[PDB]
């Protein structure tokens, strides 16, 4: 896997170029915004259970067919597997936010996931919906706009972090289905 820094050196390595001061503006910005990024990860992780449970429930309460006979969330074994998947996806998304790079999400989670869901018969439009609600809640906790909980912190702008976390969720939604 790569992080925000090794991604820069991978791009520079393709050009056989040194990473000089001209290439280090974003990485510098990364460092001074480091404490905000650590807060963002913490806020997502500290509410992981609520994020996953609320999203899978949201997916189901919008599509009653999933819990009908033949539905992919029918029986406790399938429902548990769905909840597990939601937790796994949120986990790798938090990894990507901590690293400031999507590589760990692509390599260790999204790789071969669509093929697996197709083989299993997991409804991919519903999977995307679960991810979408996770994106809504997780980015809200990062922005500090979660309706029933505000995380204590020095006030400031975390919109960039929230948008970045959302982009990782976008990658998941695009990779599946």
């Amino acid at each position: 896997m790569l992080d925000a820094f090794s991604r820069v050196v991978v791009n520079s390595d393709a050009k056989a170029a040194y990473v000089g001061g001209s290439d280090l503006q974003a990485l510098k910005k990364f460092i001074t915004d480091g404490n905000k990024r650590l807060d963002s990860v913490s806020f997502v992780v500290s509410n992981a259970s609520c994020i996953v449970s609320d999203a899978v429930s949201g997916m189901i309460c919008e599509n009653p067919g999933l819990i009908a006979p033949g539905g992919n969330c029918y029986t406790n074994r399938r429902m548990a597997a769905c909840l597990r998947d939601g937790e796994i996806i949120l986990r790798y998304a938090s990894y990507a936010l901590l690293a400031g790079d999507p590589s760990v999400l692509e390599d260790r989670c999204l790789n071969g996931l669509k093929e697996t869901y197709i083989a299993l018969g997991v409804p991919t439009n519903s999977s995307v919906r679960a991810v979408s609600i996770m994106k809504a809640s997780a980015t809200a906790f990062v922005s500090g706009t979660a309706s029933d909980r505000k995380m204590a912190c020095p006030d400031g702008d975390c919109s960039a972090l929230a948008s970045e976390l959302g982009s990782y969720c976008d990658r998941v939604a695009a990779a599946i289905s």
Binding site: S6, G21, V104
Partner: protein, 164 residues
């Protein structure tokens, strides 16, 4: 690519854990130490051609026998590849300083180096000579700050130990 972030993430992933306090605390170390290693990386990037020249020079100055027929530097093209090789390492030193880990050096220079240098009659001591010189050539605070110099030397010491 081994770094603070990739090491702590892979450890959590191996246990199926969300990032916790110790993971976040580790990344804070990346924040505090970045200034020193990014400095060293910048100095190298700004003047690598001169450092590389001195590196290759020190090699052939210590081992003139390399210029003898049948030896690794008995032609101008071969000599040019030697300085190129030194440039390769130092560019990977620049990368390792930016990453904050030995990742770039591990994957792109060190891995497989033993087999390659063995097959192509490239004496490891020759490489050692170049980077031992490069390491000891540092003058603080002339070239960089004390902590930046510590990073510079550590990366070069990593290469030398791997070469011996």
């Amino acid at each position: 690519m081994k770094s603070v972030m990739t090491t702590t993430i892979s450890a959590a992933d191996a246990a199926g854990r969300f990032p916790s306090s110790s993971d976040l605390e580790s990344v804070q170390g990346n924040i505090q130490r970045a200034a020193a290693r990014l400095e060293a990386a910048e100095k190298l990037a700004s003047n690598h051609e001169a450092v590389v020249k001195e590196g290759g020079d020190a090699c052939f100055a210590k081992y003139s026998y390399l210029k003898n027929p049948g030896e690794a530097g008995d032609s101008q093209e071969k000599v040019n590849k030697c300085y190129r090789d030194v440039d390769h390492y130092m560019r990977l030193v620049n990368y390792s300083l930016v990453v904050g880990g030995t990742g770039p050096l591990d994957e792109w220079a060190i891995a497989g180096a033993r087999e390659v240098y063995r097959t192509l009659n490239l004496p490891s001591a020759s490489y050692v000579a170049a980077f031992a010189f490069t390491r000891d050539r540092l003058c603080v605070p002339r070239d960089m700050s004390a902590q930046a110099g510590g990073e510079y030397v550590a990366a070069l010491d990593y290469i030398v130990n791997a070469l011996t």
